[PDB]
């Protein structure tokens, strides 16, 4: 018996599959947040948002927790959702926003994915100012671009959020383990330098568990986002013993059944798992 063999992984896929089929949204499904007024909520009719963990009423976003690791996964905001997207960023006092949508995607107007973090802009009352800083090589040609978004709203405390942007991670693909672990750490490390900044400042958002969470998003927020979230979860010593099965089941139950979309992305979390002698299945 090898916990990571052909057999074992076959068992993992059965379970995980039944869960996706089971979590599929029905029409007006009560488990999922529904678009109000006819305004559009969902980037893709079928990538839905669990009502219970929903962050705001008008975004497709979710508070997620696997083990002891808390973050917020979302979809790329549609143009009309930006003033709320920034609001959530500000109120969460975001220690870091990781964006995994490639530059070709954002570039292509057909996709309607605004280039919101790479330049200055005014949305409603919220004015934003971007400023590029370092640029880090993660390996295998992958590269992260770093920015700093300053969010200003009249009458509100000005908040700046550090952005980490992996511009060349194609949609529907998995970056290797090594680039993945390399990315996860770069995200954790950025998170703490900023958490530490609010901490030495006495911000009460530190007490609060709905705040100071890493916001991550790609295109649909179930693919490239999941894989990263599964590797941040594994970087936490506290999340010990938590198998891949639970890991995948919590993301899926707290967002939708498409979390960890492709079988190759899942292979990556199975690789990291094997590398720590971490279990795949439960029991």
UniProtKB/Swiss-Prot annotation:
Induction field: At 37 degrees Celsius in the absence of calcium.
Enzyme Commission number, as recorded: 3.1.3.48
Tyrosine-protein phosphatase domain segment(s): 1-276
Keyword Signal included in the entry's annotation: no
The keyword Zinc is annotated on this UniProt entry: no
Compartments where located: Secreted
Keywords: Hydrolase, Plasmid, Protein phosphatase, Secreted, Virulence
Catalytic activity: O-phospho-L-tyrosyl-[protein] + H2O = L-tyrosyl-[protein] + phosphate
Superkingdom of origin organism: Bacteria
Residues of the active site: 218 (phosphocysteine intermediate)
Principal location listed in the UniProt entry: secreted
Gene Ontology MF terms: protein tyrosine phosphatase activity
A Gene Ontology cellular-component term: extracellular region
Stated role: Essential virulence determinant. This protein is a protein tyrosine phosphatase. The essential function of YopH in Yersinia pathogenesis is host-protein dephosphorylation. It contributes to the ability of the bacteria to resist phagocytosis by peritoneal macrophages.
The family this protein is said to belong to: Belongs to the protein-tyrosine phosphatase family. Non-receptor class subfamily.
Subunit structure: Monomer.
Protein's UniProt name: Tyrosine-protein phosphatase YopH
